[PDB]
Amino acid sequence: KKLLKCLKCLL
Amino acid sequence: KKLLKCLKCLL
């Protein structure tokens, strides 16, 4: 939903 | 996290 959130979610 | 959830989350 946001870029830093995406990184946190994927990792 | 899961594929159908991703679709729902993106759209």
Author numbering:
A (entry chain A), B (entry chain B): 102 to 112
Study text:
Herein we report the first X-ray crystal structures of mixed chirality α-helices in short peptides comprising only natural residues as the example of a stapled bicyclic and a linear membrane disruptive amphiphilic antimicrobial peptide (AMP) containing seven l- and four d-residues, as complexes of fucosylated analogs with the bacterial lectin LecB. The mixed chirality α-helices are superimposable onto the homochiral α-helices and form under similar conditions as shown by CD spectra and MD simulations but non-hemolytic and resistant to proteolysis. To get a direct insight into the structure of AMBP bp65/bp69 and their linear analogs ln65/ln69, we performed several crystallization studies using either the compounds themselves or their racemates to be crystallized as pure compounds, or their fucosylated derivatives of both mirror image peptides as complexes with the P. aeruginosa lectin LecB. While previous reports of similar mixed chirality AMPs concluded on either unordered conformations or helical conformations appearing in a membrane environment based on deconvolution of FTIR spectra, here we reported X-ray crystallographic evidence of short mixed chirality helices consisting of only natural residues existing as helix bundles within the protein environment of a lectin and almost perfectly superimposable with their parent homochiral α-helices. These direct observations unequivocally demonstrate that the α-helical fold with only natural residues can sometimes tolerate multiple stereochemical inversions without significant conformational changes.
Herein we report that optimization of bp3 by sequence and residue chirality variations followed by structural studies led us to the first X-ray crystal structure of an AMPB in the form of bp65. The structure of bp65 features an α-helical fold essentially identical to that of the corresponding linear peptide ln65 but comprising a bicyclic helix staple. In all four individually resolved homochiral bicyclic structures, the peptides were present in almost perfectly superimposable conformations featuring nine of the eleven residues forming two full turns of a right-handed α-helix including the pair of stapling cysteines (ESI†). The two N-terminal residues and the N-terminal toluoyl double staple formed a turn conformation. In all four cases the α-helical fold resulted in an amphiphilic arrangement of hydrophobic and cationic residues corresponding to the helix-wheel model and explaining the membrane disruptive activities discussed above. Remarkably, the ten crystallographically non-equivalent stapled bicyclic α-helices observed in the X-ray structures of the homochiral rac-bp65 and bp70, and the mixed chirality bp71·LecB complex were essentially superimposable, with RMSD < 0.6 Å for the peptide backbones. In the case of bp65, bp71 and Fln65 the peptides were aggregated in bundles of four of more helices via hydrophobic contacts between leucine side chains.
